Every structure is written in structure tokens, then in C-alpha cells.
Amino acid sequence: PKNVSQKDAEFERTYVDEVNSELVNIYTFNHTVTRNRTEGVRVSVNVLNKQKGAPLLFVVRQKEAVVSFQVPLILRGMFQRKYLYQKVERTLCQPPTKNESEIQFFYVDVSTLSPVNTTYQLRVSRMDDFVLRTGEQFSFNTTAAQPQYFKYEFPEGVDSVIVKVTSNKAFPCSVISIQDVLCPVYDLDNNVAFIGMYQTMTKKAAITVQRKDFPSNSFYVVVVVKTEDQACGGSLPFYPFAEDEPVDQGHRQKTLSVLVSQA
Amino acid sequence: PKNVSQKDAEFERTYVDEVNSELVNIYTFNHTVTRNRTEGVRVSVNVLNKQKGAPLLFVVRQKEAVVSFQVPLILRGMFQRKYLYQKVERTLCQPPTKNESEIQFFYVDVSTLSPVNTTYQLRVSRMDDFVLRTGEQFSFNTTAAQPQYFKYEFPEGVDSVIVKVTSNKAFPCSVISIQDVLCPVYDLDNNVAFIGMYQTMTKKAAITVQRKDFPSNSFYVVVVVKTEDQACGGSLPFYPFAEDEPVDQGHRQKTLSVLVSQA
Ligand SMILES: *[C@@H]1O[C@H](CO)[C@@H](O[C@@H]2O[C@H](CO)[C@@H](O)[C@H](O)[C@H]2NC(C)=O)[C@H](O)[C@H]1NC(C)=O
Ligand SMILES: *[C@@H]1O[C@H](CO)[C@@H](O[C@@H]2O[C@H](CO)[C@@H](O)[C@H](O)[C@H]2NC(C)=O)[C@H](O)[C@H]1NC(C)=O
Ligand SMILES: *[C@@H]1O[C@H](CO)[C@@H](O[C@@H]2O[C@H](CO)[C@@H](O)[C@H](O)[C@H]2NC(C)=O)[C@H](O)[C@H]1NC(C)=O
Ligand SMILES: *[C@@H]1O[C@H](CO)[C@@H](O[C@@H]2O[C@H](CO)[C@@H](O)[C@H](O)[C@H]2NC(C)=O)[C@H](O)[C@H]1NC(C)=O
Ligand SMILES: *[C@@H]1O[C@H](CO)[C@@H](O)[C@H](O)[C@H]1NC(C)=O
Ligand SMILES: *[C@@H]1O[C@H](CO)[C@@H](O)[C@H](O)[C@H]1NC(C)=O
Ligand SMILES: *[C@@H]1O[C@H](CO)[C@@H](O)[C@H](O)[C@H]1NC(C)=O
Ligand SMILES: *[C@@H]1O[C@H](CO)[C@@H](O)[C@H](O)[C@H]1NC(C)=O
Ligand SMILES: *[C@@H]1O[C@H](CO)[C@@H](O)[C@H](O)[C@H]1NC(C)=O
Ligand SMILES: *[C@@H]1O[C@H](CO)[C@@H](O)[C@H](O)[C@H]1NC(C)=O
Ligand SMILES: *[C@@H]1O[C@H](CO)[C@@H](O)[C@H](O)[C@H]1NC(C)=O
Ligand SMILES: *[C@@H]1O[C@H](CO)[C@@H](O)[C@H](O)[C@H]1NC(C)=O
């Protein structure tokens, strides 16, 4: 039958491994959390082989929710366009814990059904600046297939805050959303407009957050980068009308500086 | 390590199996398709044990896309409400094939991390009436966690069609969308308003579809059932304000009759 291999891998290490229609890989990750100090976990993977038919299939499994994606991931534009991305990065949703110190386990499983080998490099990073401190600026890089989000913990005596996010290069377009702390977090392109307050931005954005709307005394600031700059007001490129041929967008990235300040 | 079991199960059979934090089950399904005759596949599963902490995790894997969900699935309402559902049913997205006759494989994997056993019944049904014939009425049942969709093949000489969907009982509310034929199909509640033309309905809806907007000469009619009837105009129930306690909605269902007619 199918050959499944397992490993108890660790954080902060890039594993380069092969896979095919026969091999399925499993990685187990242990993680330590405390109620007072909460910190996020980022799963980032890249593929160094160009395949168009059968992509790699990745699943990240937790105690509560399951996330999954295929890579090279294909996004959508306007007129039936296809953009191909090789590196995908996503931050997991961790529910608030009950006990003071509970060790949390999560799994990453890799598979595919293409008949030929394919190499991927996978790593998990314990994100140090998951929390946003008041009056401090944080600069970070986001692409269309690397959504990010940070947790703001409302402090005592603060009735409302204002989240200000700025960029120097106007393009690409992006969407900045404020959401409650409850799994799951809609950081994908298609579901970023379901709940929360969201603004489309190209260079600057500012959203006012109030505590009465968030009974859990915290929220998530989610940043997503779009593929086509039509919404932000740009001119769409005149790429050939390839209905079933995906074209790469090259190196499209956005550097964003975020600061949460008391109102 | 983790114990993984595998089985080459068949269509039209309900398998009742146990699982825990140690067991992971794999089912392989073979499926036969032809270019002229395309027909959908439905994966339907139920859980007969009541668990609130650690749910069952299900993944359905294809050659192209991967879908995943946790059950009993928790949906969202308006004021931080939680609705729990035990049975989940979903139809897979099958891309149009190239060769005249190609056998397609797809896998269903089941796991969980709860320390106690849990029993699930899983079945796969080859949906006979995946296609919609012109001038014919089809009646079907949908719930909030059982989205459906049917493929309409535009015939020769038809410039445009009109899709008319009706119901007798006004509630629950539902969303009816028309989308192009391209994996994936957004049949979930959070992404049903990304692409395509969609109408919210309670008793009747009608959408006009044109061929010039669909170069592939086919489309998908997707039906989704909401949880709260506020959008359709109903009065929300005065359930207790349970922020972290999910309440079941009972037996909420909608019977819908759909007909696609030439304009
Ligand atoms: C989390 O899991 C990792 C993976 O096994 C543990 O890392 C091992 O720790 C032992 C104990 O010192 C070492 O002997 C091994 O060499 C480590 N493995 C590797 C690959 O370096 C880690 O200890 C676990 N965390 C905790 C808190 O126990
Ligand atoms: C965001 O991306 C930019 C561009 O890739 C990074 O700027 C580069 O940083 C490296 C490492 O310091 C330098 O070697 C390059 O010369 C820089 N290039 C440019 C054009 O500035 C930037 O460091 C990234 N930001 C973060 C936080 O990683
Ligand atoms: C698809 O897979 C099923 C699962 O094995 C196959 O069903 C078996 O078919 C053989 C051949 O007649 C029988 O001897 C077994 O008893 C069947 N098992 C079950 C569980 O049904 C099926 O044949 C496969 N399809 C094709 C076209 O080969
Ligand atoms: C949709 O659901 C209704 C209600 O469950 C089904 O109606 C039942 O059908 C069964 C089987 O024929 C009967 O034994 C029940 O008496 C019916 N109950 C009612 C209230 O009508 C209906 O058959 C379902 N539709 C489909 C296509 O499965
Ligand atoms: C199955 O695959 C695993 C993973 O590479 C390997 O360690 C094992 O030897 C394989 N078993 C057989 C019988 O080939
Ligand atoms: C966490 O913080 C609270 C108050 O901020 C404190 O009472 C508690 O002791 C802290 N937890 C630990 C493990 O120190
Ligand atoms: C906290 O830990 C104790 C023992 O370590 C356990 O009995 C209890 O169930 C834990 N709390 C939760 C909410 O799981
Ligand atoms: C994948 O690579 C290994 C080692 O390079 C090789 O033994 C194996 O045959 C390759 N897979 C296939 C399907 O050829
Ligand atoms: C591992 O689990 C499988 C699935 O139930 C079982 O068949 C097998 O005997 C188990 N192996 C051991 C060593 O317990
Ligand atoms: C499929 O239909 C086309 C025209 O409708 C026909 O030419 C072709 O022979 C059909 N395929 C098979 C396998 O009969
Ligand atoms: C169709 O089948 C033949 C052999 O049966 C194979 O060589 C060919 O690659 C198949 N077509 C596609 C598009 O894969
Ligand atoms: C699950 O059920 C089987 C048979 O009923 C039993 O042997 C096993 O111990 C159960 N699992 C646990 C964790 O007790």
C-alpha cells in the first residue's frame, strides 16, 4: 500500500525532503504555551520543482482545527487568470488555553499523487513578535500566498485603540482586517470579508477598535496581499488570455509597518 | 508511533468505525469518468458521539485539490453564537478530463487527537443527477452543513438560460450561486460571495446565465443553507448568551426544487 514515514521534528529547521505518489510524510511538533504569554507558530514551505499537473498536498492538524493547501498554489484574478506561487506561509490559529501551562501538539503531513519525485523544504518558526505592543512599530513582509496576523492584547484602562498600518511602495494591493479571537481565522483571499472590520489599502490604513465589541479583551490584525491591483486602483497587466495556463507574477511583495496606539 | 490503517473501500456503503488519538484511517476510492458523461461524488459522514473538546478531523484528497473539515462542525451566527452540527456532506470538485476515459483516484483520511474513542459512519455516493436537464424539476434537501451543487451543461443553440429555484417552507434562509467550472468550488458559508452571481433566497429565486460569460460551456449551481435567518428577514431566536458553549439548532432543513429553462 502507501508508504507512510514519521518524524518528531523540531522548530527552526528547514527540512528538504522528496515525495511522490507512493510516499506520505508526517512531522510531529511539540509546542509550549502559557496563559500570560501567548505566541504564534508559522508553517512555511517552498517547492523547488516546477509541476503543473499534480501539486503537493499539505495538511496542518491541531487539537481543534485542520488547515490544508496545495502547492504551487494557484490563485485567481479577474478574467479567469491563474497566478502560480511556489512558497506558501501560514500562521496557525491557537485557541486560548484553560490550564496555566499545557503542552500543545500539532502535525504536518505531506503527500501527493504525481508519479514523479518532487522536493520540498518545510520549516516551522516560533514567531517571537506575535503580540503587538502599544506605541511600537513593526515592519514585516507579506506576499499574496503568505498572509499574516498578529494578536493585540487590549491593556487595562484603554477604552479603544487605533491600528495604523503604512507602506512605502504603493503596490501590490492589500486587505487589512480586525477580527475577534476565535478559531478559525479567515486569512485567505476568499473569506477575508466574512466577519470583522476590513479596509483595502495600498499605502496607508487606519482602523479604530473598541473593547465593548470584543468581550475577550484581545483581537487579531490580519494582513493579506491581493493578486490583481484593480481594486486598489491600478491598471491590470495585459497578459495573454491563457484560460488553462498559469503565469507566475514574479517577485511581488509588500513591506508594511504597523502600530497600535491608544486613542 | 501513530497507527495508520488502510482500506480500499467502495462506493455506496456506510462504514462505522472507531478512532482516537492513536488511530488514523485511510480509505482509497476508485472512480470512472468519461468526457461526455460527467457525474459527481458526494462524501457524507456522521458522528454518533457527543464531544465538545476535541473533534474528528477529516480530509478528502484528490489529484488536484484537498478539502478538510472537523466534525461536529461549529458554525457562526451573529452575536458570537455557536451552532453544532453532527452530519456533514460535501460534493468534491472534479476538473474536466483530457483523455476520453481516465480512472480517477481519491482518498479519505480520518484522524483525531482526543484520548477517548469516537465512532463515525462514512459513505461515498455516486450522485446520479449531477447534471441538470433543461425543463426538468429536481427536488433536493439541504442543511447548513450539507452544501450542494449541480453542473449545468449549456446545449447547442442556447444563448442564455434562466435558473429558477423554489421552496415551500420559507425558512431556513439560503444562498444560491452560479459559478464557472474551475476547481475549487466555494460552497462554504464564508466564501460563497467571492465569485459568481449569487442571490439570497427564502422561498423563490431566479438567476439569468449567459454563455458569453462562461467560455467552457457549463457552470455550477451551488446551494448553501445559512444558520441565522436575519439576512432573509426573520427574527433571531433569543438563545442564552453562551460565548463558549455551542447549542444545537435541532433539525433544520430545506427542500428546494430547481429547474433550468431556456430563455
Ligand atoms: C519536543 O520534541 C523534540 C523532538 O524529539 C525533542 O527534542 C529532543 O530532545 C531530547 C531531550 O534532550 C534530545 O535528546 C533529542 O536529541 C532531541 N531531538 C532532536 C532531534 O534534537 C524536545 O526535547 C521536545 N521538547 C520537550 C520539552 O521535551
Ligand atoms: C523585506 O524584503 C526586503 C526586500 O527583499 C528586505 O530587504 C533586503 O534585506 C536583506 C537582508 O537584510 C538585504 O540583504 C537586502 O539588500 C535587502 N534588499 C532591499 C531591496 O532592501 C527586507 O529585509 C525584508 N524585511 C524583513 C523584515 O525581512
Ligand atoms: C475499485 O475498487 C474496488 C475495491 O477493491 C474493487 O472492488 C473489488 O473488485 C474485485 C474484482 O472483481 C473483487 O474481487 C472484490 O471483491 C471487490 N472488492 C470490493 C470491496 O468491492 C473494484 O473492482 C475496483 N474497480 C475496478 C474497475 O477495478
Ligand atoms: C427530504 O426530507 C424529507 C423529510 O425528512 C423526506 O420526507 C420523508 O421521506 C421518507 C422517505 O420517503 C418518508 O418515510 C417520510 O415520511 C417523509 N417525511 C416527510 C415529513 O415528508 C424527503 O423524502 C426527503 N427528500 C429526499 C429527496 O430525500
Ligand atoms: C515504505 O516507505 C518508508 C518511507 O521511505 C520506508 O522507510 C520503508 O522502507 C518502505 N517500505 C517498503 C517495504 O518499501
Ligand atoms: C499570570 O498573570 C497573573 C496576573 O497578571 C498572575 O496572577 C499569575 O501568577 C501569572 N502566572 C504565572 C504562571 O506567573
Ligand atoms: C489541567 O491539568 C489537570 C492535570 O494536569 C487536568 O486534570 C485538567 O483536565 C487540565 N485542565 C483542562 C481544562 O484540561
Ligand atoms: C525518487 O528518488 C529516489 C532517490 O533519488 C529514487 O530511488 C526513486 O526511484 C525516485 N522516485 C521514482 C518514482 O523514481
Ligand atoms: C496499529 O494499528 C493498526 C490499526 O488498528 C492495527 O492493525 C495494528 O495491529 C496496530 N499495531 C500495533 C503494533 O499495535
Ligand atoms: C462523445 O461525444 C462526441 C460528440 O458528442 C462523439 O463524437 C464521441 O464519439 C463520444 N465519445 C464516445 C466515447 O462515444
Ligand atoms: C491518455 O492516455 C495515454 C495512455 O493511455 C497517455 O499516454 C496520455 O498521457 C494520457 N493523456 C493525458 C492527458 O495524460
Ligand atoms: C476503543 O475500543 C476498543 C474496542 O472497543 C478498545 O479495545 C480500546 O481500548 C478503546 N480505546 C481506548 C483508548 O480505550
Numbering used by the authors:
A (entry chain A), B (entry chain B): 25 to 287
Sentences from the paper on this structure:
Human SIDT1 and SIDT2 are closely related members of the SID-1 transmembrane family, and have been implicated in various biological processes such as glucose and lipid metabolism, innate immunity, and tumorigenesis. Here, we present the cryo-electron microscopy (cryo-EM) structures of human SIDT1 and SIDT2. Both structures reveal an overall architecture of a dimeric arrangement composed of an extracellular domain (ECD) rich in β-strands and a transmembrane domain (TMD) with 11 passes, highlighting the remarkable structural congruence. Importantly, the ECDs of SIDT1 and SIDT2 bind synthetic plant-derived miRNA only under acidic conditions.
